[PDB]
Amino acid sequence: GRVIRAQRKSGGIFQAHTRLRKGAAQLRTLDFAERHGYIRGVVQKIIHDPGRGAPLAKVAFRNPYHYRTDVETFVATEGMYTGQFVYCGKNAALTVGNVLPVGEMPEGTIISNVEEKAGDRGALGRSSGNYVIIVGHDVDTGKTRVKLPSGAKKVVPSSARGVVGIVAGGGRIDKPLLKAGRAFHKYRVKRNCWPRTRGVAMNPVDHPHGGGNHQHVGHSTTVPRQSAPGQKVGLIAARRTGLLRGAA
Amino acid sequence: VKILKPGKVALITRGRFAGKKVVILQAIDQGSKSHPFGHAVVAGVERYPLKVTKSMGAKRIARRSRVKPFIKVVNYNHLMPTRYALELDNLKGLITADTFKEPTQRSAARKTVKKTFEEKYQSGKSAWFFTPLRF
């Protein structure tokens, strides 16, 4: 046969388009100021990052050890306005836009840009309109249980940081794209993954679904988890399939 | 009862000497044929004296601890009043509104204010007036 598109997406043509992007949205390096007290920065820019549905915040901080101003690229939370003050550290106030250790926050609080590990600089709840809920704490071998946007429960060390509030950008998926052009423009600044051609519309050399006098898969689209590349197409390791009406 | 009276220390917010600390010589609310509005005659410091340490020589300390003043008529809207005030031991009535028409009169008044300001800075009872405003 022939190498399928999924196998061909290893890079090259299918790399991300990052020319117009303004920088990675990592929170900050976990330093002495954030570990023992707080540090006050002033947000000065709120900009649109192409390929990202949430605005980015350019925030200026004073370097504790050198005569220099450091600019960060915070993921802007909703309600953030230019010229305001954000506080990052253990002793920071529980205010929207402030960065605090997860273990120092009350249970049930709404946060964003949460770290999976200490010093990770933000891993969870970074997309627009998404957030993480602090479910509970456990002091003995300090660990905090949190609820992820997917609904999963994750245990993180009680020293990881998070931004109080919800990521800005609202509910972006509530508006229909309404046009192939809108979809083209959306994915142009992201990567070369659009448009997509169906496997059943292909030939047997191209896709496992290709061929036949009628456009049909022929075999089950649910493939085993340990499938070789080139045959791992369709519904990989599907626990269930079809329309579901009511479950947890 | 007046926020702006002679001897009060104010901050200049507009003009060449923006951010400079001045002392009001007379707060003339009314006006004569010329300047018939609420202006204030002030004396400020254009170049603040530089810091001096115990490790400097007497000549260098004398050179560094020098104040060059400016006398200017500034309207009320371009002033930021304070409450530190000034003694105004000598600059009471020697300088008048007529001291702005002659360049020689302006130079003489500036020299007198310079002498008073340097004498006040030496054994400074008002350090806030002579320290620069950092903005």
Partner: peptide, 29 residues
């Protein structure tokens, strides 16, 4: 004499730039 005024530095967190102290323990040798 009156012009020699003490100007101390707090050196607290987020107050003033830290002084150049010994960093030999954290040096990447």
């Amino acid at each position: 004499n009156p012009l020699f005024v003490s100007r101390p530095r707090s050196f607290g967190i987020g107050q003033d730039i830290q002084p150049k102290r010994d960093l030999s323990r954290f040096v990447k040798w």
